[PDB]
Amino acid sequence: GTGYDLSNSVFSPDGRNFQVEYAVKAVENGTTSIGIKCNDGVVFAVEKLITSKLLVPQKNVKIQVVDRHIGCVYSGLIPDGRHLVNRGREEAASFKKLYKTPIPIPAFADRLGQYVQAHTLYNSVRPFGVSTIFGGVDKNGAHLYMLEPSGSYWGYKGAATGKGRQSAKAELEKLVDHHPEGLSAREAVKQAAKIIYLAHEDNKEKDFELEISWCSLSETNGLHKFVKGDLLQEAIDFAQKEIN
Amino acid sequence: MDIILGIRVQDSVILASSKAVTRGISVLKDSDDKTRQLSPHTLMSFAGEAGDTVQFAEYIQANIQLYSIREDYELSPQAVSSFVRQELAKSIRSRRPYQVNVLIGGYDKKKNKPELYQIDYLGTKVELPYGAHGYSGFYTFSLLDHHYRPDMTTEEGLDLLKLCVQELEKRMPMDFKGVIVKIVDKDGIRQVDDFQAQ
């Protein structure tokens, strides 16, 4: 019969969880966000749809930091993203309390992965309406991950989710092919700005604000920092030049 | 300690309890009734810790009255004493035990025979022709071993208790201000209001 899409943990006749697939629809509806892995770090960028002139510029921060080396950005239901980062912050602090060393990125990825997957096992809980792009620099190199409402995550050379994910993925694939030797942290910030502007065409009706963050071993000492001031404007100009 | 006396004769149980309530230096009350009626044919006297003594007695009284209404039936003096023993047996291993020693005197309407039970705070129940708690037993038991007969009438038993009280007034250091005497038989429970000079 039917009704398999009403309850969360219910398997449909084809072995699918529809409540999870319905949560992905909330992500696809959301704002576009990207992540680029470079030669010694990662760069996160997010679109910020300006609804009206009443919004205070450079205030409504979307990119969140976990611990001191991990940066998180998500698409879809913003409150659901904040809940996941809050859990991640507790999970990162729990690791550091017992093991002294800050939580590794592949370790942190599993910690969020198990927590999101847990919300697909019970009908009393709702799946997360967010896809989270996160990463940082640890003991052995940089890592980039993208998490799904299903709990599925993988390592990425370049990640993209949201409204204009297709336009972003196409631009990210161009970078992987043209740069087999590896992009630099300086180049990744400029390129992330361009990709967001090009992915904005799927939402070109509304004006937007750009927000970039980066974690590089040579540039930021392996700590997560926001791109501010001159470097931010340099990236915006690089994007505004190549949009025409 | 307070004086709690009990004697079972031919057709009744007689309980004698001291009237004095002393706190430290002063005798506050000289007319205290250290006994509670659990049922129409069962009476329980008590002595021990200042607060625990009345609190335990009223708690037992409430449970027996609750059973009497639920079943529309009076429990036998044996069944009541077994209930009291178990309550004290649980108490001794709790956080703060009841330090109460009780004498249960009742008339079994089914057997048509009087019964007397002695239980301490530990939960040690024993059936006796005569019983006393505290230091009263040190004077009275030898008296009752000498003068007691099972076929004695209620009047004979009252005379024997009179002989016990006179000894306790002579040899004991504490002034217990006399005793209140109650009779439990087939007709129920009545108080001897003339024991001051019987």
Binding site: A118, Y122, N123, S124, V125 | -
Partner: protein, 250 residues
């Protein structure tokens, strides 16, 4: 999180039928045929090892299980539901009996404990009944040899001989003809191999058939010597060779 299923999943229908029990019994009917025969000096329990794949090792899957050194059990229906019941039955034999009386429970009491576990899976909140019927054979000092059948409802009956599973109707009819109250243990094993052949479609040998007996004490299976009162377990599983030798005299 938290089990929000605090209500019963098995309820009384307008007709008076308990649906989930009836359907659990339907699942037993689909299961492979297992049988049990009680003799004068022993009890035999047997079943077919339905190999899901020829690559799969049938030895690593025991359908006949030891509960106590004197009590054995076999099933028909759902494998996983049986396996967890065995673990629960083994533990309840210690916790509810052996750790109190210093000895293993009699057959009738261990069966009663298994029945309680299965009964609770019928009434308790947020569970389904066990999709298995069990045949429990055992021996104790004061009852002798006995055989019991436990159902998904929690109901249990003692038997002289019975079968459950696929062709339970046809097997019981054949058992009624061959059973008498003067059978020896070897005679009961002989009839067991005769009755089980009618249910088996493919190969009928010591590798496809699982058989165990509750008979005499085995001091060779005890593992230690010195205590006169300890004489060994009465439960013994027959090896692949021991079955084949008796299949030649079929």
């Amino acid at each position: 999180m938290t089990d929000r299923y605090s209500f019963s999943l098995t309820t009384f229908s307008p007709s008076g039928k308990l649906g989930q029990i009836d359907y659990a019994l339907t699942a037993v009917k689909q299961g492979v045929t297992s049988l049990g025969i009680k003799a004068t000096n022993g009890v035999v329990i047997a079943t077919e090892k339905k190999s899901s794949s020829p690559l799969a090792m049938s030895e690593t899957l025991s359908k006949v299980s030891l509960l106590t050194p004197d009590i054995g059990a076999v099933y028909s229906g759902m494998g996983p539901d049986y396996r967890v019941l065995v673990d629960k039955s083994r533990k309840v034999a210690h916790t509810s009996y052996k750790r109190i009386y210093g000895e293993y429970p009699p057959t009738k009491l261990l069966v009663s404990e298994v029945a309680k576990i299965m009964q609770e899976a019928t009434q308790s909140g947020g569970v389904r009944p066990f999709g298995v019927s069990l045949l429990i054979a055992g021996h104790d000092e004061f009852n002798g040899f006995s055989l019991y059948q436990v159902d998904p409802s929690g109901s249990y009956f003692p038997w002289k001989a019975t079968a459950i599973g696929k062709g339970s109707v046809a097997a019981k009819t054949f058992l009624e003809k061959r059973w008498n109250d003067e059978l020896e243990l070897e005679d009961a094993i002989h009839i067991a191999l005769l009755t089980l052949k009618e249910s088996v479609e493919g190969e009928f040998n010591g590798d496809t058939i699982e058989l165990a007996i509750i008979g005499d004490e085995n001091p060779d299976l005890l593992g230690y010597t010195g205590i006169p009162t300890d004489k060994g377990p009465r439960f013994r599983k027959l090896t692949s060779q021991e079955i084949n030798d008796r299949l030649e005299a079929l």
